[PDB]
Amino acid sequence: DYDGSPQVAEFVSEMTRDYGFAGEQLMGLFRDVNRKQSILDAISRPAERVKQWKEYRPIFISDARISRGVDFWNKHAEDLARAEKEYGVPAEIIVSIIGVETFFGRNTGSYRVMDALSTLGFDYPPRADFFRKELREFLLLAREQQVDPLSLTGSYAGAMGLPQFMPSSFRAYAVDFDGDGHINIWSDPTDAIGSVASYFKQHGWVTGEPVVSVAEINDESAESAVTRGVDPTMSLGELRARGWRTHDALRDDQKVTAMRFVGDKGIEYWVGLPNFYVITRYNRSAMYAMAVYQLAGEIARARG
Ligand SMILES: C[As](C)(=O)[O-]
Ligand SMILES: [Ca+2]
């Protein structure tokens, strides 16, 4: 497959030139790497019908998902208490991220990271440059952990372990959280716990600030302020000047988003506060962040 590709040889040339790898051994690795046809079909898929909150929320706030989230919390309560004390990130949020990303380990990943990132970085032009950056960080992270690169698994796009970190997030955020010398986000829940918290804190999480606020609108023209995407463009003072009223009497000066969900029992208006934006840094989706925030609430409810 990648035995003698020109681009593969030019990737190995940059690896031995900017990061000091041994080209010969590096090209012995790529001889054992498989091009995954199923990955190409997956990422070649076109626009997939986005779901209404009415249908999206019940997929992730299920009795099974919550129940297993309390078990996960019970089992690692001491590491979660440690992560929340050191990083200022709520424990229910950490559990909820892991429960949403992998269902607490049930869906860690079906492909070898080396296959996924190679297939993409060398056989998918639209984002090849991106997935060759991740391939590079992955070879770097496999060297740092002294693990062998073919033993690591992940999603079709190369997200790894319980928190589904892509290689670059692994190198920049993952932490050795039980003091044993390794960073094992695949099967060491302690490192998963600490790694998610390090991610959130380093993406701007403010400890003690609320995440979301229920909102009302004075007029249907205020729906023109619904945020297209997850990037805020106004302060809360702006949005309120547009006809949005938050039940919470929160300060004006802060960047917010405005959301209109078609919920279980009618239209739902939400204002996403900065911390809510930190959740979307994990996956650029308004419904994702809402499912994570509410799931963390259900699990904290059921745990007591
Ligand atoms: C896909 As990620 C949580 O490493 O940005
Ligand atoms: Ca560790």
Based on the fold, state whether residues 210 and 259 are members of the same structural domain. yes
196 Cβ neighbours under 8 A, 6+ residues apart:
83, 89, 94, 97, 98, 163
Q: Which residues are catalytic?
A: 101
Based on the fold, state whether residues 125 and 226 are members of the same structural domain. no
Neighbours of 285 (CB within 10 A): 16
Based on the fold, state whether residues 67 and 176 are members of the same structural domain. no
CA of 183 to the centre of ligand 2 (A): 4
Based on the fold, state whether residues 60 and 203 are members of the same structural domain. yes
The answer to whether residues 299 and 96 touch, using CB atoms and an 8 Å cutoff, is yes
Burial (CB count within 10 angstroms: exposed 0-12, middle 13-18, buried 19+), residue 64: exposed
The answer to whether residues 193 and 177 touch, using CB atoms and an 8 Å cutoff, is yes
Our count of domains for the chain comes to 2
- Phi–psi pair at 225, nearest 5 degrees: -90, -5
CA of 167 to the centre of ligand 1 (A): 8
The answer, yes or no, to whether any atom of ligand 1 lies below 6 A from the CB of 282, is yes
Burial (CB count within 10 angstroms: exposed 0-12, middle 13-18, buried 19+), residue 106: exposed
Nearest CA to ligand 1 atom 2: 165
Largest CA distance in the chain: 67
Q: Which residues of 21-46 are buried (b: 16+ CB within 10 A; e: fewer)?
A: beeeebbebbeebeebeebeeebeee
Assign residue 132 the CATH number of its domain.
1.10.8.350
The answer to whether residues 232 and 276 touch, using CB atoms and an 8 Å cutoff, is no
User: Over 152-202, what HEC string results?
Assistant: CEECCCCCECCCCECHHHHHHHCCCCCCCCCCCCCCCHHHHHHHHHHHHHH
**Resolution of the structure in the document, Å:** 2.5
The answer, yes or no, to whether any atom of ligand 1 lies below 6 A from the CB of 157, is no
Atom of ligand 1 lying closest to residue 101 CA: 3
Q: Is 270 helix (H, G, I), strand (E, B) or coil?
A: strand
Strand partners of residue 24? none
The answer, yes or no, to whether any atom of ligand 1 lies below 6 A from the CB of 186, is no
Distances (CA, A) of 177 to 173, 180, 302: 12, 8, 26
93 Cβ neighbours under 8 A, 6+ residues apart:
200, 279, 292, 293, 296
146 Cβ neighbours under 8 A, 6+ residues apart:
none
Q: Is 72 helix (H, G, I), strand (E, B) or coil?
A: helix
Strand partners of residue 214? 270
Q: What is the CA radius of gyration of the chain?
A: 21
The secondary element (H helix, E strand) that includes residue 110 is none
Residues within 5 A (CB) of ion ligand 2: 176, 178, 180, 182, 191
Decide the pairing of beta strands 255-263 and 234-235. antiparallel
Based on the fold, state whether residues 238 and 267 are members of the same structural domain. yes
Assign residue 258 the CATH number of its domain.
1.10.530.10
Q: Which domain holds residue 16?
A: 1-46+109-181
Name the residue of 89, 134, 282, 284 whose CB sits within 8 Å of the most ligand 1 atoms, as the mutation to test its pocket: 282
How many Å apart are CA 12 and CA 17, to the nearest integer?
8
- Phi–psi pair at 18, nearest 5 degrees: -100, -20
Based on the fold, state whether residues 126 and 236 are members of the same structural domain. no
How many Å apart are CA 178 and CA 79, to the nearest integer?
8
**Amino acid sitting at position 212:** V
**Amino acid sitting at position 180:** D
DSSP percent split of the chain into helix, strand, coil, nearest 5: 55, 10, 35
How many Å apart are CA 60 and CA 116, to the nearest integer?
26
Which residue bears the tokens 């650029």? 284
How many Å apart are CA 196 and CA 214, to the nearest integer?
27
Which residue bears the tokens 């040339």? 13
Nearest CA to ligand 1 atom 5: 282
Strand order in 244-246's β-sheet?
234-235, 255-263, 266-272, 212-217, 244-246
Measured from the alpha carbon of residue 186, the closest ligand is 2
How many Å apart are CA 172 and CA 275, to the nearest integer?
20
Based on the fold, state whether residues 263 and 124 are members of the same structural domain. no
Which residue bears the tokens 């990422």? 43
The secondary element (H helix, E strand) that includes residue 24 is helix 23-30
Q: Which among 133, 180, 179, 176 has a CA at the least distance from the CA of 158?
A: 133
Based on the fold, state whether residues 129 and 191 are members of the same structural domain. no
Name the residue of 89, 100, 169, 281 whose CB sits within 8 Å of the most ligand 1 atoms, as the mutation to test its pocket: 169
The answer, yes or no, to whether any atom of ligand 1 lies below 6 A from the CB of 159, is yes
